[PDB]
Amino acid sequence: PTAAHALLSRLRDHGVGKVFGVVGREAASILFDEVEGIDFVLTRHEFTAGVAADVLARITGRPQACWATLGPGMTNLSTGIATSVLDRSPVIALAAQSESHDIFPNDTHQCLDSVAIVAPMSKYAVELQRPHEITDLVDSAVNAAMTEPVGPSFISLPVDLLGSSEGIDTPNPPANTPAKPVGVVADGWQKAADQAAALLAEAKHPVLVVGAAAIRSGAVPAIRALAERLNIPVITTYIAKGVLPVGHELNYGAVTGYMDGILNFPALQTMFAPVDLVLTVGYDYAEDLRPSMWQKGIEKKTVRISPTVNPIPRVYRPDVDVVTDVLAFVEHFETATASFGAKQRHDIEPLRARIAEFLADPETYEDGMRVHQVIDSMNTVMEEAAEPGEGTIVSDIGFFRHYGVLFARADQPFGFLTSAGCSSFGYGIPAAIGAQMARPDQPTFLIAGDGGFHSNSSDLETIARLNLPIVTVVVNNDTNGLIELYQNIGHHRSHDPAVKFGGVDFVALAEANGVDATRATNREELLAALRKGAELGRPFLIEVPVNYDFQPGGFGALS
Amino acid sequence: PTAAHALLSRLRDHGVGKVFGVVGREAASILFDEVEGIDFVLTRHEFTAGVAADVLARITGRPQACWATLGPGMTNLSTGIATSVLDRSPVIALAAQSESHDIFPNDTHQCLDSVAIVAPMSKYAVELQRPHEITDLVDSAVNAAMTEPVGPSFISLPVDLLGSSEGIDTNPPANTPAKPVGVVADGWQKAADQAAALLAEAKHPVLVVGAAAIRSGAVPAIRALAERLNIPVITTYIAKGVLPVGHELNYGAVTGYMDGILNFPALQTMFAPVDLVLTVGYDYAEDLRPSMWQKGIEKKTVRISPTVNPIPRVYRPDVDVVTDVLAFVEHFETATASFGAKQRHDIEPLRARIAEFLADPETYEDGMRVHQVIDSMNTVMEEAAEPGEGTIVSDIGFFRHYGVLFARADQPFGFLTSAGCSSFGYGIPAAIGAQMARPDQPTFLIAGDGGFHSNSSDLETIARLNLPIVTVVVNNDTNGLIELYQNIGHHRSHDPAVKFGGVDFVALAEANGVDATRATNREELLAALRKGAELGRPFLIEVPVNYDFQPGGFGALS
Amino acid sequence: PTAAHALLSRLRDHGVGKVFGVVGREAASILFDEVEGIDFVLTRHEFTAGVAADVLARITGRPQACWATLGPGMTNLSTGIATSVLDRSPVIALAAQSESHDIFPNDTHQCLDSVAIVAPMSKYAVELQRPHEITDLVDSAVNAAMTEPVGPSFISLPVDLLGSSEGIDTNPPANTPAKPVGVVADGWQKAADQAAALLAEAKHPVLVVGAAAIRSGAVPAIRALAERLNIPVITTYIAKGVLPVGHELNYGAVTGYMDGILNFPALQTMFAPVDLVLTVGYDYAEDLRPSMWQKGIEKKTVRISPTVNPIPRVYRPDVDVVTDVLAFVEHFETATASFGAKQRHDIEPLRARIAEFLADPETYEDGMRVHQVIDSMNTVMEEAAEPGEGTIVSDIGFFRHYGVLFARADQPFGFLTSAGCSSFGYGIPAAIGAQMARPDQPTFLIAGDGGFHSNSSDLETIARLNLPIVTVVVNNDTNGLIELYQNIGHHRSHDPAVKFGGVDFVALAEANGVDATRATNREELLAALRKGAELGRPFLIEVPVNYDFQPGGFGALS
Numbered sequence A: 001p002t003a004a005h006a007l008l009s010r011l012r013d014h015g016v017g018k019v020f021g022v023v024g025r026e027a028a029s030i031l032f033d034e035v036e037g038i039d040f041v042l043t044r045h046e047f048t049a050g051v052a053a054d055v056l057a058r059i060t061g062r063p064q065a066c067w068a069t070l071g072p073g074m075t076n077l078s079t080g081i082a083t084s085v086l087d088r089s090p091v092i093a094l095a096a097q098s099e100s101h102d103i104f105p106n107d108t109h110q111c112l113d114s115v116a117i118v119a120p121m122s123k124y125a126v127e128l129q130r131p132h133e134i135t136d137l138v139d140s141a142v143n144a145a146m147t148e149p150v151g152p153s154f155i156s157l158p159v160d161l162l163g164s165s166e167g168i169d170t171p172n173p174p175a176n177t178p179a180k181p182v183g184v185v186a187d188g189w190q191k192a193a194d195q196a197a198a199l200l201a202e203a204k205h206p207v208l209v210v211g212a213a214a215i216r217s218g219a220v221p222a223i224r225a226l227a228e229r230l231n232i233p234v235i236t237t238y239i240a241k242g243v244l245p246v247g248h249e250l251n252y253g254a255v256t257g258y259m260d261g262i263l264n265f266p267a268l269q270t271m272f273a274p275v276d277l278v279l280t281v282g283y284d285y286a287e288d289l290r291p292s293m294w295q296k297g298i299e300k301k302t303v304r305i306s307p308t309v310n311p312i313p314r315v316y317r318p319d320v321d322v323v324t325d326v327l328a329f330v331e332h333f334e335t336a337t338a339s340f341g342a343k344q345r346h347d348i349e350p351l352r353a354r355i356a357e358f359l360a361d362p363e364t365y366e367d368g369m370r371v372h373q374v375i376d377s378m379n380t381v382m383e384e385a386a387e388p389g390e391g392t393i394v395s396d397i398g399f400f401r402h403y404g405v406l407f408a409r410a411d412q413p414f415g416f417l418t419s420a421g422c423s424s425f426g427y428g429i430p431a432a433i434g435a436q437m438a439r440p441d442q443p444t445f446l447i448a449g450d451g452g453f454h455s456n457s458s459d460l461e462t463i464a465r466l467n468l469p470i471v472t473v474v475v476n477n478d479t480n481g482l483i484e485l486y487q488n489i490g491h492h493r494s495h496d497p498a499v500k501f502g503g504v505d506f507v508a509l510a511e512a513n514g515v516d517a518t519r520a521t522n523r524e525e526l527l528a529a530l531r532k533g534a535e536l537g538r539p540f541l542i543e544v545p546v547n548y549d550f551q552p553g554g555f556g557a558l559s
Numbered sequence B, C: 001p002t003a004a005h006a007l008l009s010r011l012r013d014h015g016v017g018k019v020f021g022v023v024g025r026e027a028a029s030i031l032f033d034e035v036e037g038i039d040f041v042l043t044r045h046e047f048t049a050g051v052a053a054d055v056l057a058r059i060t061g062r063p064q065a066c067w068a069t070l071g072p073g074m075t076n077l078s079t080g081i082a083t084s085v086l087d088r089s090p091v092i093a094l095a096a097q098s099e100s101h102d103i104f105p106n107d108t109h110q111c112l113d114s115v116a117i118v119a120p121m122s123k124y125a126v127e128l129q130r131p132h133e134i135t136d137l138v139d140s141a142v143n144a145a146m147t148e149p150v151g152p153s154f155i156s157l158p159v160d161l162l163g164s165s166e167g168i169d170t171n172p173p174a175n176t177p178a179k180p181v182g183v184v185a186d187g188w189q190k191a192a193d194q195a196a197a198l199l200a201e202a203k204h205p206v207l208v209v210g211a212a213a214i215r216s217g218a219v220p221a222i223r224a225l226a227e228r229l230n231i232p233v234i235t236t237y238i239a240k241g242v243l244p245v246g247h248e249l250n251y252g253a254v255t256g257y258m259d260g261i262l263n264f265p266a267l268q269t270m271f272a273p274v275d276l277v278l279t280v281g282y283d284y285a286e287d288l289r290p291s292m293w294q295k296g297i298e299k300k301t302v303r304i305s306p307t308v309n310p311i312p313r314v315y316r317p318d319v320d321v322v323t324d325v326l327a328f329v330e331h332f333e334t335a336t337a338s339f340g341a342k343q344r345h346d347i348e349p350l351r352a353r354i355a356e357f358l359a360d361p362e363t364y365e366d367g368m369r370v371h372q373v374i375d376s377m378n379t380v381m382e383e384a385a386e387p388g389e390g391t392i393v394s395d396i397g398f399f400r401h402y403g404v405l406f407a408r409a410d411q412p413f414g415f416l417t418s419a420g421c422s423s424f425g426y427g428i429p430a431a432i433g434a435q436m437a438r439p440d441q442p443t444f445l446i447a448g449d450g451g452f453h454s455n456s457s458d459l460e461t462i463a464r465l466n467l468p469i470v471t472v473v474v475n476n477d478t479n480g481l482i483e484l485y486q487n488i489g490h491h492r493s494h495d496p497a498v499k500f501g502g503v504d505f506v507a508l509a510e511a512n513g514v515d516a517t518r519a520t521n522r523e524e525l526l527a528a529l530r531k532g533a534e535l536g537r538p539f540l541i542e543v544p545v546n547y548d549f550q551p552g553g554f555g556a557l558s
C-alpha cells in the first residue's frame, strides 16, 4: 500500500475520476487500478492528455489530472501545461522522474530538471521527496491551481518513491477543494464599484466586455440579469461566447482583432465607436481582447473588474479598477444601480447584417468551399441535434478559427471552445475529447484546419477507442494559412517552403484510425455529412477543401 | 535588411544550409528566403524539426538549426531540445517571442518565459534585446553548443526585434570548431600512464566505446589500438559500427534488457572474466551503467572523457582521464607500443545465442517476432548498401532493444536511436536527418505502433521531401515496453494504461502519400523491403508482432 | 529629464519620502535630488537600508524604498530583502546593474544575474529595459508588494537606462492601496459561521493573534470581541501590545524557548485546558507553531488569514477562513452577538512566574540577568513614554526571547523584532526605522554582543541622523544562543564556534559619535536609561550579562 495508492486516493478525494496521459516505465510503481473510482485515459501523445484535462476542468469548474513519464514525457506534457497556464484551468500535472538517489539532470538517462523547466509556466511545482507527503503536495497543488489566475500545478514523482510504502499508514484529512476559484480582493473595492456605478449613471452607451473569469466566478445569470434590466450590450472574448443565448438582443457577439480584415467591414468601429463606458468584467489580457481593439471613435472611460491585481498597467490603465470576485462585484453593482433605468443601447445592425450575409453566402466557388459556409452548415446541424442551451462547437487554431469566433453558434457558456491564451495547434481533438466527456449526452462538433489537425491527428485513435461521438470537420487548403497571411502582411508576398504542404487524405487518415469519414465539397454534401455524423452514435470525420482569398492590407488591427 | 537576415546569414557562416521547423506569426518578420544557401524545412510538429536537426548535427559533426513560434511552438520544440541535450548534439534552437515591449509571461497572449523554461535543458539560453547583437548571440550559442558535453543552445527572438533593421550596417570570421571543444585536466598524461600500467597487468581488458569517441574523431585510432593489442570493443547503442560487422573484436552493444530478451546470462558472458574495463568517451546518459559490467570478478576501471565526472556517486573509476578521446588514444598508443597482445575472453555462447535469434525459422500463430523482422531488415540492407554504408534507425520501445542486439551497423552511427532522451516518435525525424546527411545511402526505420503513431503525421513530410526512407512499423496494439514494466512491478497488466485499438498503418501511410504494404512472414517482409529499397520513393511496411515476455529475467534494469 | 527622475517621481506618487541605501557608480546617472519630497538616507551597509525600509513600512503601513549598487551592493541588500519577505513588509528594493549592452553575468565586472538571485525571495523581480517603462514597473512592484503575503519587489536598473531620457515625455494616478490586497475564498462566511458554532460549544477558547491582524486594521475589533466574550488573547512576538499592558485578557506572547527560560511548564499552563484555538492572522513564519499549543486536552482550530494555507503538512485547521482579518472579525461579531461570555482559564501561576523574573532583586556575582535588564528598560520606557506609545526593539539572540516574554508593549508593534527572518544585526536598522516612523516617541533597542557587532558600524548613521535611540548591548562575549544549541545537541560547548574576545562597546559607540556608558547592575542601568531617554541624542549602554542556561529545558524547540 504505496505512495501510488495515496496519490490516486488523494486525487479522488478532490473529485478526480479520470487521469489522462501516457504511462512510462513508472508503471512498475503505479498500475492505475489501485483506487476504485479513478480511471486512466490513455492518449497517443501527452499534449492531448494535458489539453483534455484542461478542458474538462474548464467545463466542470473542478481540478483534473494528467500524467506523463520522465524526461521527454514531461516536456511533451508541458505544452498541455502551457495551455492550462495561459487558458486558465486548474490542472494537476503529474510526471515521473528518475529514482531519487539517481537524479542528475542532463546526465542520468532521461533525467531532466522537471521542476526547474515547469516552474515558470505553473502555479506550483515540486518534486516528491518523502512518500507519505504526496497527500499534502496534492493539496497544495490543488490550492495553487484553484487560485486566480487558475492554472496548472506540477508534481515530479521519482519512480522509487512512487513505489514506496515507507511512512504510509491506514484516515485522510478533509480535501477542502475550494468551491470556486479563490481570488484577491482589494480593501476599498466597494468604493471602487460605487465609482463604476457613478460612471454608468452618466454614460450614454456603456458595454459589458465579459471574459472567462466571469464564468468561473458563477456570475453568468447575474450578469445577464444586470444587462437585461439596464439594456447594456454584452460583448465577449472567444471563450465567453454563449454567456447570452443565440438571438438575445444584447448578444453583440465576440471580438477578434482579425474581424475587420475577415469581414472587409469597419466592425471594431461599429462595435465600439459610440461607446463611452467599457466595463471589462473578468478581464484577462491573455484572452487577447486588448484595449487597442475598443479604443475606437469617442473617448471612453474604463472599469476593470478582476479577482487579480492588474499585471499589465503598461497596456491597460483602467479609470476604475475593482479587484474583487466577479460575482461579488455584480451583486454589489445591482444594489448600487437598483434605482437606475435602462440605457439606449448603440446600434450594431450593420455589423449583424454583414455577419449574416457571410453566413448565408449562396455562391459556388471554383476552388473549394469558404469557411463561413462551412460554419453556417455546422450551426444548422448543431441547432437541430442539440437540446436548447446545449452542444459544443470546438475549434483548433488557424485562420479558420477566427471565422469560428465570428460565426460559430454558442448557446451556452463554453458552447464555443477554443484556446485563447495559448493557442497551440492540435488543440481541437483533445478539447473535443474533454468537452464530450464533460457533456456526455450533448453533440460535440470540432472544426480544424489541415495544418493544426495533422499536428495532432493520431489521437483520432483515442476518439475511436473511447467511442466519443465527436463530429470533426477538417477544412483543408494544404497550407498553414494563418502563416501565409502573416507572410503577406509583413512582406507583401508568400514563401511556400515555410507554409505549404502536399496532399493528405484526411478521410482515409480517419479510417486508418477506425473513424468513419467522408468528403464534402459544397453545402448540400456538408449538411448531409453533418446530419449523418450527428446521428451515427460513433465518431465521424468530414474533409472539406477550402480557400480563403484574404486581403493582407486589411489586418492593421493586429499590430 | 533586418535581424532576420543577419541571423540567417550568420547561421550560413557557420555552415548551416537548412533550418527545420514550423513558422508562426513571426513570418511577418522572417520569410526564410533572405539568404541564399539556407532553406527552410517545414515539418508537421516542432519535435520532428528538433530531432531532425539533432541527428543531422550528429552525423555531419556540424551545428544545425531548428525553429518554432512563440509559446506552444517553443514548448513543442523543447522535447527536441531535450533530445539534443541528453543525446549530445550541437543544435541552435530558435523561437519567436512576443514583441519586446509586450513580454509579460503568462499574461500576454502566447507568451511564456522561454529562457527560464529552456535554460535547465540547454548549454546556453538568451533573449534577443538589440537587433544587431543577433550575430554575437549566434556565435555564443555555437560556442556553448560545441563544448563538451555538446548540446543545444537557445535564442528567443521578439517578433519586433527580429523584423527590425535598427543598428544593422551593411561580418567577422565565424571560427566554427571542426570538432567539439573539450575539458582537459592538468596531469591527464600521468593518469593515462597509470591506465597503461593497468592494461599491462590485465589479462582480459575491454574497450567500452561511447559516441563521444566518435565525435572526437577517434574511431580509426581506437580500432588500430584494439587490433594491435587484441582488445575487444563493446559499444553503447549508437557506437554500434565503430568496428565493421564481422570484425572479430566487435563484441556487440550492451543494453540492460539483453538478458531478458535473450533469456540468457549475456551480461555475465560479456563481462565476467574481464579484469579491466576502459570506458572510452564515457557518458552515463547513454545508459551503459556500471552495474551492467560489474559481473563476475572484480574489475579495475579507466574513465576517459572530455568532461569532469558528473556522477561520482555511481561511477568512481580507478583512473579518471579527463581529456580529448583522440588525444588519449594517441598518448596511450605511445605508452603501450611495446606491450604484447592480450588473450581476449570468450563470448561465443552469446554470439551463438544472438545468431540463433536472428535465424529463428518458427512461424508463430500471433504475428512475427521482432528478431525475425530485424534479420530480414539486415539481409536487405546489406544488399542495398555499399560496404560501410546504410543507416538503420530505431524509434523507442521494447523492439528498440532488439535493434541494439540484432541490427546491422557497418559504419559509425549506422544504427541510430535516441539513447539519452529516448522520446517515442524519434524515428521519423531521425530517419529524415539520416537520409539528408547520407543522401545516396539506404535509410531504414523500425518503429513500434505506440511511438510511431505518437509522431506519424510527419509521414507527409517524408513524402513532400521525397526521402526514400523505408519504414517498418511493428504493431502489437500496445505500449509493449510499458506492459513489461507493469509485469516487472506487479506481476500483472492493466490494459487501460497500455492498450490501443487497431490502427491500419498501411492505410495511414497512403493517406499521407507514402506507398505501403502489410507483411506477416519472412517471405512477404523480404519482398516488401526489396520493393521499398529500389522504389526511389518512401515506403512503409506494417508487420504484426507479439513479444511474449518473461518479467523475471529483467533484474538488470533495477 | 531622465528615468532617474521618473523613478523617484513615481515613488513619490506612492507616498515615499525616503530612500535608504548605499549609492555606487550609478551616482553618475542618479543624484537623488531630482525630485523634491524624497531624501536619500545613507547607511554604512545595505542590510541596514533594507531593514529600515522594512520597519518603516511595517509601522506606517505604506510602501518604502531601499537602494544599492550592482553586484555586491545587491547581494548585501538581499539580506534586507529576505527580512522583508519573511517578516512580511512592502519594500521596493532597487539596485543598479551593468550597462544594458554589457550585461554578462559572472563575466562583466560587478555583474550578477540580479533578477535570478532575488526572484526566489521576492514578490516581483524585473530588469528595466526601456527607460519610460520605469513608471509601470514601479506600479507593478507596489501592486505585488502590497498583496498578501506582503513583501518586497525588486527592480534592477542598468546605469545607462537609469540615466537615459529616451521616450520620457513631459502622468497617471498611482492608486496606492491603503491596506494590503488580500486573498478571499468563496464561502468564507460559511467557514466563519462554522467557527462561531465551535466557539459556542467551547469552554476555554483563546485568540492567538499574529501581525497580519494588525495590518488588517483589526486590533480595536479583536479587543472588543475578546472583552465581550471574555476570550484571552495570546500573541506572536510582534503582535505584543494588541491589548494594553495590564489588561486581564493579555495572556502574553508565546516563544518556543519560554519553558527553558522560565524553568516552568509555561506552554502547559497557557494551553492545556484550552479546547479551541483561533489563530487570527496566522503565519507560520512568525514561528508560533501548532506543536506549541498542542498541550493537554484535544483542541479544535480555526485558521484566519488573507492567504491560502501554505503548510497543510504542518497545520490542518478544523476550520479554515481565508479572508481579510477585519472582515472576519466583523462577520464573527454578528454571528456571536447573542453568545454568553466564557469562563477564561487560569494562568496566574505563569503570570506570577514572569513577574518573579522581572522583580528578581539579587545582584549576581558575574553579569546581570537579561530579565533584570528588561525590567529596567520597561520601568524607564513607561516613565519616558506617553500612554499607548514607545517602542522597544530587539535584535536576535537568546536575549531576544527574554524580550518576547518580558518586554513591555503598550501599542501594536510596541515590541519589534524580526520573527520571520531573524538576521542578527537587525536592531540598529529596526530602531532607525521605528524612530523615524514615531519621531516623538522613545525608542529603546536591546541587542547582544554577537548580533550588535555584526552591524555596529551603522552607529555612525544614528549619530548623523541624530535619532535619539537608547541602545542597550547585553554582552557575554558569546553567540550565546548558539552555545545553547551546541549543548542541546551534544551536551557540551565548542568555543571556537561561538566565543569572542572582548569588545568595548562604550568606546565603540563613542568612536562613532554616540555617547555611551557601562552599567553592571539595576541602579546603574536605571540611571543610564533615564539619562539616555532625556538626552535628546542617541545613547548606548553596555551591560555585561550571563545566562547560565539549562539545556534539558528546551525540548519544545523540535
Ligand SMILES: Cc1ncc(C[n+]2csc(CCOP(=O)(O)OP(=O)(O)O)c2C)c(N)n1
Binding pocket: A396, A397, A398, A399, A400, A401, A423, A424, A425, A448, A449, A450, A451, A452, A453, A477, A479, A480, A481, A482, A483, B022, B023, B024, B025, B069, B072, B073, B076
Ligand atoms: C504549436 C504551434 N506551432 C505553430 C503555430 C502557428 N500556427 C497557428 S495555427 C497554425 C496552423 C494553421 O494552419 P491550419 O490549421 O491549416 O489553419 P488555416 O490557417 O490553414 O486556416 C500554425 C502553424 C501554432 N499555433 N502552434
Ligand SMILES: Cc1ncc(C[n+]2csc(CCOP(=O)(O)OP(=O)(O)O)c2C)c(N)n1
Binding pocket: A022, A023, A024, A025, A069, A072, A073, A076, B395, B396, B397, B398, B399, B400, B422, B423, B424, B447, B448, B449, B450, B451, B452, B476, B478, B479, B480, B481, B482
Ligand atoms: C514522449 C514519451 N512518452 C512515453 C514514453 C514511454 N514509452 C517509451 S517507448 C514507448 C512506446 C512503446 O510502444 P511501441 O512503440 O509500440 O513499442 P513496443 O514496446 O510495443 O515494442 C512509450 C510509451 C516515451 N518513451 N516517450
Ligand SMILES: Cc1ncc(C[n+]2csc(CCOP(=O)(O)OP(=O)(O)O)c2C)c(N)n1
Binding pocket: C396, C397, C398, C399, C400, C422, C423, C424, C447, C448, C449, C450, C451, C452, C476, C478, C479, C480, C481, C482
Ligand atoms: C545573519 C545571521 N547569522 C547567524 C545567526 C545565528 N545567530 C542568531 S542570533 C545570533 C547572535 C547571538 O549572539 P548575541 O547577539 O550575543 O545574543 P546572545 O545569544 O549571546 O544572547 C547568531 C549568531 C543569525 N541569527 N543571523
Ligand SMILES: [Mg+2]
Binding pocket: A398, A449, A450, A451, A475, A476, A477, A478, A479, A480, A481
Ligand atoms: Mg490550412
Ligand SMILES: [Mg+2]
Binding pocket: B397, B448, B449, B450, B474, B475, B476, B477, B478, B479, B480
Ligand atoms: Mg507496440
Ligand SMILES: [Mg+2]
Binding pocket: C397, C448, C449, C450, C474, C475, C476, C477, C478, C479, C480
Ligand atoms: Mg552574546
